[PDB]
Amino acid sequence: VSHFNDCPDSHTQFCFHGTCRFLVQEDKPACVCHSGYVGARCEHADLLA
Amino acid sequence: SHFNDCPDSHTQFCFHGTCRFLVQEDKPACVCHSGYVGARCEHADLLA
Amino acid sequence: LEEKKVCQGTSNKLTQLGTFEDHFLSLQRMFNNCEVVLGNLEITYVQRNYDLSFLKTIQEVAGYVLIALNTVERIPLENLQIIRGNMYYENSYALAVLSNYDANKTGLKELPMRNLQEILHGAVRFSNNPALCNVESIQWRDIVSSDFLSNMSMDFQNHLGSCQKCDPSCPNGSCWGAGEENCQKLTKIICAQQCSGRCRGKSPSDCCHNQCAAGCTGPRESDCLVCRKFRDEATCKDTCPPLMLYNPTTYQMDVNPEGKYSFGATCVKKCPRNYVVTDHGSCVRACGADSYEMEEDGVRKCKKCGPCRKVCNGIGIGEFKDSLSINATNIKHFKNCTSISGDLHILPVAFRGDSFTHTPPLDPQELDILKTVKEITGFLLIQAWPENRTDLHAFENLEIIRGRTKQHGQFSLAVVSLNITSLGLRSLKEISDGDVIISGNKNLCYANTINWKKLFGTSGQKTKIISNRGENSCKATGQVCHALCSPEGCWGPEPRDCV
Amino acid sequence: LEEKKVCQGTSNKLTQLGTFEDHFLSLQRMFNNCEVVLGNLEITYVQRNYDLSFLKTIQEVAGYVLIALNTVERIPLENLQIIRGNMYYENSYALAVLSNYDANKTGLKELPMRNLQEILHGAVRFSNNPALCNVESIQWRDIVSSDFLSNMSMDFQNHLGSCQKCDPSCPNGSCWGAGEENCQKLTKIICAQQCSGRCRGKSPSDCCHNQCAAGCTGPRESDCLVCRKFRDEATCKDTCPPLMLYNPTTYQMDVNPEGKYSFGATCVKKCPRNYVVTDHGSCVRACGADSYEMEEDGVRKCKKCEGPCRKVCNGIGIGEFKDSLSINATNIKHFKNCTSISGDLHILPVAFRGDSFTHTPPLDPQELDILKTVKEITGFLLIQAWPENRTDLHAFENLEIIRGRTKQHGQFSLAVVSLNITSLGLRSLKEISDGDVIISGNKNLCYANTINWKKLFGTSGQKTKIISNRGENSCKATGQVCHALCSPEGCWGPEPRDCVS
């Protein structure tokens, strides 16, 4: 978007369960987890399923 | 003057010295034989 | 005597949890009626018109505070008085407020933290908040430890303009927002020289007790706003009153009738359930290298060995503070452990290897190392297992899972989204506390045969064992407990799989 | 860090040790270069013109201060700063100045305690000091505990004419003597309200740390004149820094690099070898009722009793024996089947003879054999009497250990004096952990010298004083040396089994 931009897709994913996006102002990658996941890298399942 | 004489000399208050009454402070005190210490001259003065 | 609604906290940093709305429900659920935050407070991506009024109850935040990428007009953290900063953000900050707006259109306008009197550790940073009003006028030298004021790399702006000037009744023109309500309260920069901590005013009779943080309503201990270190009923102590006191004229330990135990940052009459009691009148989650555990008659208390069993740290602490899972790199350290002080995580990353973290795949065979682990003090979270392993054989000797620490504050054992056909947990005889969730294992067939209640050791423990392999299909394919198992089910189809 | 010379102090109260001439010597001997009296400071019966200048070095007194029946004119306790009051005189006073005058109203006149600024515990009591000057001007409200001011019994009615005027520069005409240097230095009543204890001035910037006793030279915790409780090297602390500190965040116990051990009123880096080390980071004299002492590496620690363990018995001078002078009829009742004595054993002549002042029936000498089961004595063993029908310390034939955590007169762990025994007979004795040994005045004793006492000494400094018993040349003459089979190092008797090796 405006705060974000593509993310160099490495062989091993940065966001285990969601998509990466590079946010411009902080110049670093972040995630947008798939429903049912949490974590800085969307690595945990919300056991509160 | 400051001293009198001790009461019921039963047994003995002082173990190693003579008993004397302190007229003033109103109470018995002791005078130990050389080589002893204590309010009742009960202890040998080990330091020697 | 006077609790205080406490809650978990989060660590998603700049990540979004699904849609804005989804993300928002997650936030609201994690901090609803919360007064104390043991973890961090992360307010991110909240959009315009979402009500954050529920945030008014937050009084303390133990970790750090991250406010970022919010377009909402106001974040009413009106009662947050303290940010301890036990754990930081991006290595240096206890308070980070970043990029709060969208396309130079709308953004975070007001952040009325008129009671934020103290930040014990860590620095503060503000960046790209083009609509934030007033915060610039704040005198941080009254809130952040001097040994942190230098790491402060802030930068404000008024590219919104709809900013009102601080009320004329404010100090040196300092405020957190419009109104006299939001004027900045000074409590460390205007104090009388003869004073150590915070103060009510500049009067020598207006100083606070050393154990006071932020400010105080009086000159005494029971008169603090928030406690510096420990909290005892209604007092702030540097350390909890010992259960025993030494007697200088007895060379003996006398029993202090006014003694209490250390439990986190609070002193209490007796340690809670499932914690260990030490010789020092404190409640710990793990003993020392030399000690072990004893109970059945009283409370689990540590002692001391020489044939002590090997105790290895768990993922999350020790040499694995920022380690996501058991992996190729670390699996060596769990050498020949019998007990884990902490938790065990096994995520899919462990098998794929991880670039961003320089970790190569883990050889499935390696997991057999865990066969010596007989007990786990924290929790066991399994989100992945080697592709061709029928069950969790590597844990078939695990006897006790204590739950001293739990996933998301709730779960003690979490087995989800695997392809195992049976559990295999043959030795699992006790799950001290915490809930058990075994879901999304499409081919898992014996889970429900086990009577879990018989393994629990705390009230309220429940299970969530659904959406695995359908009972009907398990029966059809004949995958049920062996004939010699009329008792409490089995952990697999095998005879030795029976409870 | 201990920076002052100590000494024992006395407990003679109003008793006089022989002739005024002798009495003085003891006094002079017991306090000569003393700076800290661990016990009581008793200056009594000192006569006119006797030099007491050796009292200028005294700085503090743990127990009480008794000044009575002295005709000497000046008692220069010029540097005494604090009287802790750990033990009282007459059950109430930490300081008692009583009847210090001869016949013709001649007596003590100058008691310039120009530094006495604190009496932590106990009341003060002046009385019958016909010649005592200045002292009446003293304001004891800045010196004594606010809890004993009413327990007070001051008085200084004298010959106003023989007493000089304080001095212009004295706070409320308060002085201990003539001249400025004796004006009553104040450090409590003149404090800037907001302070919690002694101060060093009237200003709010001028007051002492909460732990400072008497007074201070700074505002910190290392500027105290003297400490109220513990002493941690150069600081005064409410408690010694614990070896372990709870970690509120991680919920576990951390190691405190500032950790120290609590020994009496000090914070030390290590506990004394003879002492027990508890799990609370402190040196103790003994363990609990359902435990015992274990040896390991070097430090001695306590351990829970596996079963109905070895029975321990309180000694004389502790517990229900705090005021017992010796094992006696009334006592014995409690010393049967004892295996260890936690504390001390005192055997005085009073035992067998009986005391009427404490209605203590005579003792049956035969009964002391119940002690035969005692193998350990935590403190010291003092023997001043022994049944006449015994030639060796029979009842102690099994004693193997004397730790000496406590010592008679602060010096001895073994004191056998003036008995009629022929041989010690301490065949099992294997260790005297601490403290000196004295064996003297036993006219018939013959082998005490053959023992290699230094072999039984587990603490540097320990020494023996084995004299005035039955002479060596006399013991040899009647052939009372160690047996031939004792080729080794001495014996405890003449028989073969009294040998050491």
Ligand SMILES: *[C@@H]1O[C@H](CO)[C@@H](O[C@@H]2O[C@H](CO)[C@@H](O[C@@H]3O[C@H](CO)[C@@H](O)[C@H](O[C@H]4O[C@H](CO)[C@@H](O)[C@H](O)[C@@H]4O)[C@@H]3O)[C@H](O)[C@H]2NC(C)=O)[C@H](O)[C@H]1NC(C)=O
């Ligand atoms: C597999 O196991 C190994 C070992 O258990 C584990 O390695 C650990 O990786 C983490 C980071 O992933 C290391 O800790 C980090 O070290 C960096 C040093 O540059 C620090 O900067 C980090 O601090 C914070 O700030 C960083 C910003 O610069 C962030 O990127 C970071 O996330 C932190 O917020 C952090 O301390 C750790 O030292 C190693 N351990 C060892 C001994 O190698 C690995 O991550 C595991 N892999 C997986 C995916 O399970």
Ligand SMILES: *[C@@H]1O[C@H](CO[C@@H]2O[C@@H](C)[C@@H](O)[C@@H](O)[C@@H]2O)[C@@H](O[C@@H]2O[C@H](CO)[C@@H](O[C@@H]3O[C@H](CO)[C@@H](O)[C@H](O)[C@@H]3O)[C@H](O)[C@H]2NC(C)=O)[C@H](O)[C@H]1NC(C)=O
């Ligand atoms: C009371 O104590 C004093 C001082 O004692 C001394 O100092 C203490 C701090 C300790 O360290 C003691 O161990 C030490 O003795 C006694 O007075 C002192 O007596 C000694 C005699 O032993 C004098 O020693 C002198 O030494 C020089 C050589 O350096 C000789 O030439 C002298 O002939 C003499 O032996 C010492 O001068 C003296 N101190 C002074 C200068 O005042 C005192 O005797 C003692 N009272 C008693 C007997 O208990």
Ligand SMILES: *[C@@H]1O[C@H](CO[C@@H]2O[C@@H](C)[C@@H](O)[C@@H](O)[C@@H]2O)[C@@H](O[C@@H]2O[C@H](CO)[C@@H](O)[C@H](O)[C@H]2NC(C)=O)[C@H](O)[C@H]1NC(C)=O
């Ligand atoms: C947000 O929290 C409130 C909490 O309301 C009550 O008071 C809290 C201190 C705590 O004790 C809660 O358990 C109480 O319920 C929730 O409001 C309650 O909702 C329930 C139904 O879910 C209802 O029966 C109560 O009457 C409500 N209490 C009130 C406000 O009067 C609310 O549902 C929570 N929403 C979330 C999870 O975001």
Ligand SMILES: *[C@@H]1O[C@H](CO)[C@@H](O[C@@H]2O[C@H](CO)[C@@H](O)[C@H](O)[C@H]2NC(C)=O)[C@H](O)[C@H]1NC(C)=O
């Ligand atoms: C003999 O032993 C008895 C018992 O311990 C002693 O009696 C105590 O005497 C003191 C005197 O100060 C009292 O305070 C105690 O209360 C007494 N104890 C009991 C229970 O009677 C007695 O003093 C001893 N005889 C001596 C000292 O020679």
Ligand SMILES: *[C@@H]1O[C@H](CO)[C@@H](O)[C@H](O)[C@H]1NC(C)=O
């Ligand atoms: C002592 O004298 C001072 C004058 O310097 C006075 O302030 C104080 O009140 C007096 N103390 C008494 C006895 O009240």
Ligand SMILES: [Cl-]
């Ligand atoms: Cl490591």
Ligand SMILES: [Cl-]
């Ligand atoms: Cl490693």
Ligand SMILES: [Cl-]
């Ligand atoms: Cl199987």
Ligand SMILES: [Cl-]
């Ligand atoms: Cl000196």
Ligand SMILES: [Pt+2]
């Ligand atoms: Pt959550």
Ligand SMILES: [Pt+2]
């Ligand atoms: Pt700043």
Ligand SMILES: [Pt+2]
């Ligand atoms: Pt204890």
Ligand SMILES: [Pt+2]
């Ligand atoms: Pt045990």
Ligand SMILES: [Pt+2]
């Ligand atoms: Pt003495």
Ligand SMILES: [Pt+2]
């Ligand atoms: Pt008085």
